[PDB]
């Protein structure tokens, strides 16, 4: 949900609008919600991840006090931390 909020912020045209994800509970069916989200932002489906959002994604994956994500996002120096934890 935080990643979706970041995408909203990235692709909103300098206008604070109503977030599609007002609460996390409605993401329990994420396929339809992601569909509606990226129909609001069609250009997000064609634009590669801006690296500000990439670093945000990496620090989200490394956010402490969170269940570590079930994937390796990067192969930087902290690859063992992602691989073994």
């Amino acid at each position: 949900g935080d990643f979706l909020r970041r995408v909203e912020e990235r692709f909103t045209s300098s206008a604070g609008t109503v977030s599609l994800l007002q609460n996390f509970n409605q993401l329990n069916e994420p396929e339809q919600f992601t569909a509606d989200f990226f129909e609001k932002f069609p250009q997000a489906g064609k634009q590669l991840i801006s690296e500000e959002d990439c670093d945000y994604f990496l620090m989200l994956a490394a956010r402490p006090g969170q269940k570590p994500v079930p994937f390796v996002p990067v192969l930087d120096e902290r690859f063992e931390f992602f691989f073994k934890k």
Partner: protein, 982 residues
Amino acid sequence: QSRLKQGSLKSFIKEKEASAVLQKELDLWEAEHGEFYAKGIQPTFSALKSRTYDSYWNWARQDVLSMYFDIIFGKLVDRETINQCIQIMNRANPTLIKFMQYHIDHCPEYKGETYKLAKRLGQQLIDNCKQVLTEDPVYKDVSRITGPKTKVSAKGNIEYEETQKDSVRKFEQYVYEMAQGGAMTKQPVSSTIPSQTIPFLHIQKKTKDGWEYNKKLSSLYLDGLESAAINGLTFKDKYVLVTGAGAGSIGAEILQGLISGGAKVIVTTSRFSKKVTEYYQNMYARYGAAGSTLIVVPFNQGSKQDVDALVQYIYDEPKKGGLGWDLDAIIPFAAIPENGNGLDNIDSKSEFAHRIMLTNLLRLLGAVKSKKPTDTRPAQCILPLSPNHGTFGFDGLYSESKISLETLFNRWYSEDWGSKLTVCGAVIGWTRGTSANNIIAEGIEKLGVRTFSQKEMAFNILGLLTPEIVQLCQEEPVMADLNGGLQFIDNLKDFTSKLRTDLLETADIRRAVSIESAIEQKVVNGKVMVEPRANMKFDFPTLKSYDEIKQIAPELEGMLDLENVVVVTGFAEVGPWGNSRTRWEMEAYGEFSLEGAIEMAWIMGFIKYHNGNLQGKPYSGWVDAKTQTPIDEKDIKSKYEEEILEHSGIRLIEPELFNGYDPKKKQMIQEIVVQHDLEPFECSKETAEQYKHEHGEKCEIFEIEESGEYTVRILKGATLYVPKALRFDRLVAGQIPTGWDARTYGIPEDTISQVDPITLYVLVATVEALLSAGITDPYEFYKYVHVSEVGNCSGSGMGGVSALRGMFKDRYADKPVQNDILQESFINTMSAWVNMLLLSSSGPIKTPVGACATAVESVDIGIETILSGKAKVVLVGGYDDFQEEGSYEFANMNATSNSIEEFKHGRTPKEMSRPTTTTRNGFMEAQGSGIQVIMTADLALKMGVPIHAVLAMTATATDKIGRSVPAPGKGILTTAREHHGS
């Protein structure tokens, strides 16, 4: 010696006591008048600060195109459209008729119903302008008659809005309801006025005592208003002097109407600035009719000096620096707002405002009269009389001034200025600003009396400037009660206070009940917005569908040698407004978007991207530079907009960007022969030997046996150079934004130190142009092209100026200068360094010199290079830097504009560069670089780079025999070459 040790101390104490005498004189005047009245009498007016607008011929076409494209895109049939049509008709001339005829007769209808609408509306407007051909420009106000309306929401929020009157839609119906009057005020509109009923707008005739409502004069005035509403009103050959016509005032709408009718108006502004200049510029561009001329002047009506100087300037002939105009009307609506000033609070502000409203007004009228020897062209003075002389509350001397203006009616007869000025005292009614009284406007209107808009009041006064009321004023002073029946309200102040206090006591209790009900609900019961951030893209040209492109262009398939067709694949800038993106945003829009603001802050080093830990909390985003604190993307604009605009674009030369170069303190040295030899100074062996070598017998060198260093005595007759400084005429330049650093783009400090800033601009621009072409890696050229076919045909006109200054002056001064500064001074070393750092091409390397016209020449040489087969890709463009000596030499030849004369004319740096303008007086020197990666069409398609455009033509030319190097000429007319004697 016969000298006095203390003579000059004596003179000092004498002059100190004189200064004290002058200071106590000034302090007495000041304690007598006050600081407000004191600093309010300064001279504001200056004849050189006057701004003329007369290019209605241009603005007609400008507005025509604006409306044409607005309708073509569906942004606009409506009243504002009809108003713009009236303005274009007012500016209608044969050239404009041909302009619209072309643009409509070649408007494709098949593109859409929107294009069909644009066309048919254009045919109608062409017919209307053809009918208007040769007839006068008429002020015709077609805005919908709006009335007050206040709604207190159930939450207690007062909202006031101007809402179109149901029974009144046009100014014709406005005049009709004026004639009808109201219950309280008890074929032409003369026959409409009900018997024993006073219309809201009426003219009062002076009986054998006072002023009373008059039927015939009121009917004449209302008939003039009806004629103005239906046919419009011409003010051609009307020379007006209007004061108090700033934005959001009755006078501004008066000026709009006058300049629509074709008047030649001198508008006063007490706050002369670029903002006000632009406001009056676009007001003339909209409303300035055929024959109209707007003269915006700085002017303080609080100063008799300003009054006399402005009147002198108006009545002086153009040869003597004036306008050579004889005023037909005067509208002195300039006033100072004074609130909370009772009898006991009559202060400096009140006396000064009274001076403006009455005394300097009378002086202005008297100055006009003194300037007129003719007795057959009176000036119509539209006095802003008030119906409320002290009935309302604490207003200072406002009521005193307004009632004092009523003596002019009797003074018209009693004195000998009747043939030079006519008195038209307009008792202006309740006018809605377009705020504290707007909320009670509806309440006062509900009882039968009415309340005017600024447009309505302006229409009333402009009708008071009718030919009929003009001659009426000529034969008899006119008292025009434009009060909307308010005179018939007993205890107006008490009624007004009752209305306002009822409204406030309703809104506040509703708000309090809402707040406490919300708190009660919160006690009983115990959306998140998205935060915008920059979506920076490059926006390669939008590649449309093949069907639609083949619809754009005819069956051209397989005709052009794409190898011989050259296309811009990339481009970039380093300039006063950052790069191409930010410069284009400021050009096309005049303001930075979110992406533009963040980009400007980034290039200027206001912000830097932070990743990792920031005060423990993990942060990934922009942070401040000087404080390293987080900056949200909205606060980027909110915090850095003012500094970005202040330190970008054309602005005062900043010495920090040019090695301490202060134009105000331009350093020079003068040769002086020593008359009395100087005392010894110590220097090294080689330094002393160099001194002896230079000075010969005019200096002595001696070794100090104790230290071994030499001491130098500069004997009499030696020459030395004492520094001196002069104030340089040019203080403003188009400089790269302050904080622009090559490190921000990533050029190593080794390159920055060894290589000159012009080349740093070139490197940044070349990188940005290649990556505008999508060339992430410059070596990706060599995946499709041989190293011998990537050229660099860019070049400067005088590039390397910093290195030139080094070698020519710093070396003369023995300052630390790099051994290879001449190497960096060459104009081709920029392209050299570009190749050595980025490309590593062995392709053709051309470096044009063209002074101002070298980048187009670079493009031409690039086209030639590609088409000859010597290259497939080439970097074209041009670059230069701003430096002290180049600026000084451009000033010597009077090529740049004198900023001191510009300040004398009231101009600011943001408006110093005035291309194709009446008063332009030289160019604005800037610095920076501009690069384009141009390629063959076939290669651009093969590599899939963004084809920005096609270089269909490029050419260079010289003028003729002459003896003027900088003089431009018609040589480049050699690009349009054809025999007519296919």
